[PDB]
Each structure stands twice: as C-alpha cells, then as structure tokens.
Ligand binder design. Structure first.
Ligand SMILES: *[C]C(=O)[N][C]C1=[C][C]=C2[C]C3=C([C])[C]=C([C])N3[B](F)(F)N12
Ligand SMILES: [Ca+2]
Ligand SMILES: [Ca+2]
Lengths: 563, 80, 80, 91
C-alpha cells in the first residue's frame, strides 16, 4: 500500500518509534492515496504522535491526499478534539477538499460535538467560518450546517454573542450587549444583483432554525433580542401602516353603520329619510371610507405587481376585493345617488367582511395569532367534508319536504334544506313540527315522519356533530404540538417577507446588528441516536481489538504447550 | 354478510313504486310514501359511493366507525 | 361578534332582537351556543315578506351557523 | 374523539390501501385479454413539457453480534494464557 515505516508507526500511534525514524530520517513520503504520516496520526487522534511529527520541519503539515484533505480534515472527521486543537495551535492551513468541504464541514456532517467546540472556543474561528465556498449543494455556510446538525454547539456560539462586560449584577451601570454577527449575511447577498451572485434570503440563521425545528435555539436570548431588534427597526412600523390604513376604513364604516338607521339612504349632507344632524361626522366617515377603499385598490394593485400569478392562488385577496368595492357602493352617494336598498345591501356585505378580514390582520401577532391558525385549520377540514354535508342535507331535506309538506318550514325544497341545516345543531322543534301535527292528524305519513325524526336525530346532531368535534380535537392537538415554534416561525416569515421587498439603503439605515440592554437601569430520539453512534464506534473498536488478539496468537512463543 | 346490499334493495324497489304509474296506477299516498323512502336512501347510499375516493373518502370511514360504536352501545340507549 | 352582530343589525333591523347595535351583539352572543331561532327570526319573517334582504339574511344565517356554533365552539372544545 | 384519533393515525395508509383494494378487486373480475390491452407497464412522464422502534431493533442486532464477537474474543485470550511462555514469573 506504499506505506513507509513512518506511516505504519504513526498509523498505530507509537510516538517513541516515530521519533526514532525521524531521528534517522524519513522524508515524509506519501503512500497510495497520498497520505503522509500526519494524515495517519490524525486519523486516530494520536496527539502525542502528532506532536513529535510537528516539531521536525513543518513541511508536512499542509499536505494533501488524493481528495485534497489536509491533516485537519481527518482529525475533524473522526472526532479527535485534542488533535484539531494541536493542529490549530500550529498554523496549519484551512482549505477545501475536492468536495468543497472544509474541516469544519466534515466535523458537522459526522456530528463531532467535542471537535466543533474546540473549533469555536479556540482562535482562528472567524477564518474557518469564512473559509466555506458557495455554489455547493452540500457543505453550505458553516452556520447553516450548525443549525442543521449540531444545535447544541450553536447554543455555545450564541453564548459568545451574549456578553456582559460587567460583574455587578443588578447595577445601574450593568448591561448585557447582544451581538448579531452570526445571525445574518451583510445584506448585499439578500437582493438579486449581477455583482452579488449569492441569493441568500434574509434572516439566514433564523430561517434555518425554523426549517430544522430548532425551537431551543429560537428561544435563546440572542435570537429573542434579534427579533425584537427587527421588530423595532421596521417590523412594528410596517405592521402599523398596514393595520393603520385598514382601520382608516374599518372604523369609519362602523361609525357610519351605528349612527344611521339601516333602512334609508343618506347623502354626504345627512340622512335623506331630511335629518342633517351631526352631518360633519357622517361626511368625514363617508370620505374616509372612500379614500381607504381606493387606497386598498392601490395596495392590491401593488400586490399583483409584486406577486404575478401567485397572487391568484390566495383566498384572502378575494376577500379584499369584495371589501373595497362594497365599501365604495356604500358611500357612492358622495358623487352619484343610488337606491337605498342597494346602498345598505352593500353596506351589510362590507361591514360583515371588514371584521372578518380584520381577524386575518391579527394573525401576524403572537398572543392571539395562534387561534387564527386554529380557526383556519378547523375551517379547512370542514370545507374538505362539505360534500358529506350536502348529501346529508339533501337526504334529510328532501325527505322532510315530502313528509312535512303541509308545514310552512317545509314548503319549497330550498326552504326544507335550510330548515334541515338549522336543525343540525339540535334545534329540532318536534312539538310545533312533529308532535302537535300528529295529534291534530295533520301528518300525512305519521310513522315515516317519526322514523325520519329518529334517524335524523341520530345522524346529524349526534353522529355528524360529534364527528366535527372529534375532528377539531385532533386538529387543535397537532397545532398545539407545534404552537411554540409556529408563533416564532410566523414572526420570522413576517420579517423575511418584509425586508425582501424593502430597499437596501433603507435596510442599511435601520439595521444596527448589536444592541445593548440595561437590565436594572430603567428529547428522547436524540438520546437513542447518540447511543447508536456511541455503539457504532464501540463495535468498530472491538473489531480492531479482535485482529490484534488474533495477531498475538499468530506471533507467540509456544514451547511448553506444544501437545 | 354485507349491510350495503340491503340498502340497494330498498333503493331499487321503492324507486319502482315511486314511478309505477308508468304502467299501473296506484294511490297517491303509497306513491309518495315510497318516494320519501327512495329519495332519502338514494343520497344516503351516494355517500357510500364517494368512499372510493381520496379527498373526502376518509370522512366516510370516520362516519362508519362512529356509527358502528353507536350501534354497539344501543342497548344502553334503550334502557335509559 | 362585531362581524355577525353588525351585519345582523343591518339585515334583520326590523325585528326587536336586532334594533340597536348593542342589542344585536348580545343576541349574536346568545346565538353562539346554537340557539339560533331561525323561525321567529328568519323563516316567518321571510314568509311574511318582512325580510329586507332575504338572500343575504339566509346567507348570513348559514355562514353564522358554520362559523360560531360549529367551528368556533368546536375550537373551544378542542382547546379544553 | 378516540375513534377519530386512531383513524387519523392510519389515515395516510388507509386512503392508499383503499385505492389498492379497489384496483385489486376490479381486475380480479376483469377478463385477461382486456387486462393485456390496457396495461402498459412503463410510463413516460414529461415534467416540463406540458421510526423509533426500528432504531431499537437495529441497535439490538448491533449489540447481539457485539457480544458474539466478545465471546469469540474471550476464548482467544483464554487460549493465549493456555499457550504462553512463563519462565520469569513462575513464583
Ligand atoms: C454563513 C451565513 O449564513 N451568513 C454569513 C455569510 C453568508 C455569506 C457571507 C459572505 C461573507 C464575506 C464575503 C465576508 C463575510 C464575513 N461573509 B459572511 F458574513 F460570513 N457571509
Ligand atoms: Ca392581500
Ligand atoms: Ca352492492
């Protein structure tokens, strides 16, 4: 295999005999696959063998194998923390292999926890952080694999960002400075540019956290301060213009509804009925709803300019389009008169859909936003079972239309279905509909009507409504299972989508990347996977041990026991 | 040994008695009595024909297992 | 309750349960449990031509019954 | 609630097993010459033109051969002491 005795002595890690060969001269040759003695001594973690090798010439510390791995690549791949600490105390170069992986990438892929802690806690940590290469599917930015593979060592990295620079706890001059140097690109790689070929979407470490389910990293005090920095920079401001422009039409609609009697029409001069009392209030709320609606057109027309053909795959946008037209038809007597029946018909649609859509604007919160996610997932699985409702209401509604035909609730087929839909909750009347018609001999088919009554009561209020309850219990259960991550991922996706459309010069102004906080001045499957790796190297050691014992019997003096 | 087949047998006879005045006249009370049975059981059985789907067929399996454990406790309802 | 109560205040305005906005919300809060009347409030006004907007009132009735007694009350059950 | 819970626990497999049992019962009664006509056995699709108990059972087998190796290792070491030169340490 081309191994010199220097290779064999360093492979099994015999430091005294590897000192003897260097005392004579060994030239540090490379075998087949191009490994020197330092590649063998590192793959094995014989730091005492690596030490005497590294004190001779330093001409071997930067050699490359057939894949271009240096000695730090092997010591970090097999997880020898004292070997990489020795190989970094000496200024051995940090490079990439043929697969564009640094030694930090190999330790992260092989999940070597004690190695990457010695990479972080030692010097040269920034220069192996920036040593990665782009345009590579594996071996990305070293932070992103640290989220992806070793989140506990990212927590140690975040502890280095949270510095105090003080020792007087609960003092007036006491402060905790949070640094966000590891949570973000420098924002030039966030926007598409011909000079910036990198297309890293912003909030890189936090978007990696919500993808890799790292909830313990998201609740870190550096990441909480980072989101609160992003909130106060532009997140609270952009949320207040969006909610503020909506309330500019929401509130004057509600003032206009509760101050005018919903029958008759009204000019801007007042109610026609002609009242002309508090006509200043009616005029400005008429004006404010009209301007907020045409602001909502330009808000929606600006949304289709930024989102082409994926705008129309959203159901919330058609709610806004109902909202803004019916707002205008409610206040169209600013310019042209309309019938009072049409005005309040569009008024009832507008004031209903305003508050239904205002429910969606608090989805971008934390204390009450999880109930809108629960409301959406229950509503989605009710519209997924809507055909079972249609066929049950057609079964019971058309049969009740035949049986109870002489009663006014069941006179047309389209009033039989609505009444059957009203009896769905358990509001079967049974006295004015079943019993008192039966005692007056007004039931045409008495025995079928009571049989349809019993079969209705079993199916729809008992069985069907308990099905929707049991659907909703399971749907809330898996939402609450991921609820703590969902509210943080909604905050991250908010700020990610916000500064994706913000200009870069504005983002340079509001970002501050390091905040100073004065405190006193104003779980089981991971244990099994750790145990499987702790057993996989145990059986690897035992097989390596077994060939040694087989070698002992192979080379042993036997004279007294020769049968 | 299948309960869905007796639903079809109610469906097809009561369909014919609803439209038996094609050939022989019947009383109006009998015709609409079989009409109410037929139009009720058509849509109840059409619920079974969408069990052989994917987007809504899982609710029929949920509807069947809830209905099976309600008819397993029917004697507790009778005695209450 | 502001969405459904103010819309019911506009649609069913001639009925005494929905006469002021502050009595429309309490009635909508009372209909939350499934005590939608539908006969003295929706059906018999419709058969007497006393509904101003008939097609919207039944559409608001169906959308209320889906949202608040069915969907919203099952959300509170599954939370509990 | 309990009846929907164990249906939804197997729901992703249930819809696929209902599709499989559909086609299995369908072509069990279909004629063989018709099945020869409609089956094509290789389709070409143009895309752009138009979990824990298994870990334990893997670990048990990775431990069962480990103790098998160690027992095989133990008889070798017992053989070393059985056939060994001892002159300096003969008490
Ligand atoms: C890793 C992550 O994720 N972030 C961070 C980054 C990205 C990209 C980049 C670039 C650069 C340069 C050129 C320099 C530096 C420092 N950098 B960084 F920030 F690392 N990055
Ligand atoms: Ca929108
Ligand atoms: Ca059949």
């Amino acid at each position: 295999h081309g191994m010199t005795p220097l290779h064999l002595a360093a492979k099994n890690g015999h430091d005294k005999v590897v000192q003897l060969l260097l005392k004579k001269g060994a030239l540090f040759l490379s075998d087949h696959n191009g490994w020197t003695a330092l590649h063998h001594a590192s793959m094995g973690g014989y730091t005492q063998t690596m030490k005497v090798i590294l004190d001779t010439n330093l001409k071997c510390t930067d050699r490359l194998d057939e894949d271009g791995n240096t000695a730090l690549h092997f010591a970090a791949r097999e997880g020898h923390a004292k070997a990489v600490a020795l190989l970094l105390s000496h200024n051995a170069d940090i490079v990439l292999n043929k697969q564009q992986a640094s030694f930090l990438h190999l330790a992260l892929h092989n999940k070597r926890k004690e190695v990457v802690l010695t990479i972080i806690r030692s010097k040269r940590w920034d220069e192996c952080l920036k040593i990665f290469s782009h345009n590579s599917p594996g071996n990305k930015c070293p932070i992103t694999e640290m989220i992806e593979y070793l989140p506990e060592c990212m927590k140690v990295l975040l502890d280095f960002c949270m510095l105090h620079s003080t020792e007087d706890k609960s003092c007036r001059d006491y402060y905790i400075e949070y640094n966000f140097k590891y949570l973000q690109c420098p924002l030039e790689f966030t926007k598409k540019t011909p000079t910036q070929d990198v297309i890293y979407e912003p909030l890189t470490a936090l978007n990696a956290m919500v993808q890799n389910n790292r909830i313990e990293l998201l609740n870190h005090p550096v990441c909480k301060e980072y989101l609160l920095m992003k909130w106060l920079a532009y997140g609270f401001r952009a949320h207040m213009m969006n909610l503020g422009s909506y309330c500019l039409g929401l509130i004057p609609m509600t003032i206009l509804v509760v101050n005018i009697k919903p029958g008759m029409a009204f000019n801007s001069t007042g109610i026609i009925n002609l009242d002309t009392t508090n006509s200043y209030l009616i005029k400005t709320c008429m004006i404010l709803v009209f301007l907020s609606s045409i602001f909502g057109y330009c808000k929606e027309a600006g949304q289709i300019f930024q989102q082409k053909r994926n705008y129309f795959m959203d159901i919330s946008n058609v709610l806004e389009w109902i909202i803004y037209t019916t707002g205008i038809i409610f206040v169209l007597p600013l310019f042209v008169e309309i019938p009072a029946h049409l005005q309040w018909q569009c008024g009832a649609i507008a004031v209903y859909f305003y508050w239904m859509n205002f429910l969606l604007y608090l989805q971008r919160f934390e204390n009450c936003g999880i109930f809108i996610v629960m409301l959406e997932v229950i509503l989605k699985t009710l519209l997924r079972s809507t055909v079972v409702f249609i066929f049950l209401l057609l079964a019971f509604g058309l049969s009740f239309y035949i049986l109870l035909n002489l009663q006014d609730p069941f006179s047309s087929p389209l009033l039989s279905i609505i009444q059957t839909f009203s009896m769905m909750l358990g509001d079967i009347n049974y006295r004015e509909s079943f019993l008192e018609p039966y005692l007056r001999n007004e039931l045409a088919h008495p025995v079928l009507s009571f049989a349809q009554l019993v079969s209705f009561t079993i199916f729809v209020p008992i069985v069907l409504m308990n099905l929707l309850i049991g659907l909703a219990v399971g749907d809330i259960a898996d939402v609450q299972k991921h609820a703590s991550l969902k509210r943080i991922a909604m905050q991250v996706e908010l700020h990610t989508s916000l500064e994706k459309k913000l200009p870069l010069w504005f983002l340079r102004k509001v970002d501050q990347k390091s905040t100073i906080v004065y405190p006193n001045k104003p779980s089981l499957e991971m244990e099994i996977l750790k145990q499987k790796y702790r057993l996989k190297d145990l059986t690897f050691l035992l097989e390596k041990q077994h060939e040694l014992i087989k070698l002992i019997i192979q080379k042993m003096e036997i004279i007294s026991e020769t049968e």
